[model samples]
Target: GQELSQHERYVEQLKQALKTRGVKVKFADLLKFFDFVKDTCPWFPQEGTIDIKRWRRVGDCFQDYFNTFGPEKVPVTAFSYWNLIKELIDKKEVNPQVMAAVAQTEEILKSNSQTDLEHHHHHH
Candidate 1:
């Protein structure tokens, strides 16, 4: 239910611009940028036992932080977010029920059943 805010849209736009220049701006780059900000800057306000608005303001600077990582490390940085999420899931920090439900939904979406075919054939 969390929609992409203006800042998130801006970050997407930047990625699009980078793609136009024949550079592959990956999801990993964004993830890496997030990690760097979370790790390096203690003063960076985030969603840590605070109001959501404060977290939103900090999240707006995502692209700016992403720019800090050079092209060479973008992919690695993006993968870092994945690792972080996995760790959180492993540690039971993330809701196991939510994860399981999502996994099941994904499996259903990707299933080869005739019911799925009937449901999504028009969309495809």
Candidate 2:
């Protein structure tokens, strides 16, 4: 096997998925910021080792804050954003319910097939 770390699946609807949380961000600078992570993030190649995808959703969770915090503040670039994620990887929780990646989120939905009204990604 050609040993190289990689990922697959679910990205097919990623655009829509982001839309679920992203809504309408018409700032090209922010778009560039998002692309920055894929361009050369040291962690991109280590997705399996960590959860950059999960980091992405977590970022999405905070996009409301970063997108335009304090009613007028601007968001940060992807490099620092991803780095921010790395800083918290080992220290995450409850917020994890909404911060979890789309794929993991979908799995959480299934985990609640027999729902009991547990909110936030259908916690059983």
Candidate 3:
């Protein structure tokens, strides 16, 4: 690498943190795995949905941090705007437990024997 951009340095720090914590896989590949999660589930999580709420809780847990990038493009600086993109692009994936919930919800819906699934699962 050449002089190494600030953002790249920030990324190195981020990836190192990720290494000590989890995701031995690189950031770009982590993105692809997340992409696979979306591809496999293929469901759009609407606003105020359960998935969104869960994501919020996770964010709340993590947002209390400041690897403080007052100058660099990392930690908070990156999320300054991209968090919503993070939320939006982050589809309903990565919850195996919720996967079971969807399955049961489907079976229960089938018990209704009605094809009104178009508008039912919206209430609760």
Candidate 4:
């Protein structure tokens, strides 16, 4: 078994937290959520040192999201959430996986909007 890096460990924690709350998320959403957790928490391990304060902060942020957004709107919220970190992706600050996920998410959103438009036209 491979030892998880600090970043991977934190990401897994966030993923499990979301899963426990029944939050359905795709890869891009996970990346975005991870970024949010990292930003709001602020004390996340940077040089291999752990801080429970950061974990608490991250947990609180996730809880806030779960409480603030209804489950039905979580997908939309996650889609819109990517807007907040668009610049980071554009600047190549994120890993390749994040970039690929963002690209795939954009395609999915675009396809959905197109279907919505088509359905609207069909009703006219």
Winning candidate number (TM-score): 2
Task: Assess candidate 3 and give its TM-score to the true structure.
Answer: 0.25
| Residue 1 CA displacement from its true place in model 3, Å | 24
Please give the clash total of every predicted structure, in order.
1, 0, 0, 0
Top-lDDT structure, candidate number: 4
Ranking by lDDT: 4, 2, 1, 3
- Kindly list the per-residue Cα lDDT of model 2 for residues 1-124, writing each as its tens digit: 0111111233323333335444464324333544444333434333433444456654554455555554234345443544543443444343342244434434533443322444356213
Evaluate model 1: give its lDDT: 0.39
Shift in Å, residue 10, candidate 2:
4.2
For model 4, residues 60-110, the per-residue Cα lDDT tens digits are 555566668665534445434543334334543334444444344334334
Per-residue lDDT tens digits of candidate 1, residues 45-90?
2223222333333444443455786555344444444344333334
Please state the error at residue 8 of candidate 1 in Å. 5.4
Error of 4 at 121 (Å): 38
Candidate 2, lDDT over the whole model: 0.39
Residue 106 of model 1 has an lDDT of 31
Q: Which scores better on lDDT, 1 or 3?
A: 1
Q: Provide TM-scores for the models.
A: 0.25, 0.28, 0.25, 0.27
User: Which regions of candidate 4 deviate over 4 angstroms?
Assistant: 1-23, 46-54, 61-124
Stretches off by above 4 angstroms in model 2 are 1-11, 26-34, 50-124
RMSD of each: 16.8, 16.3, 18.1, 14.9
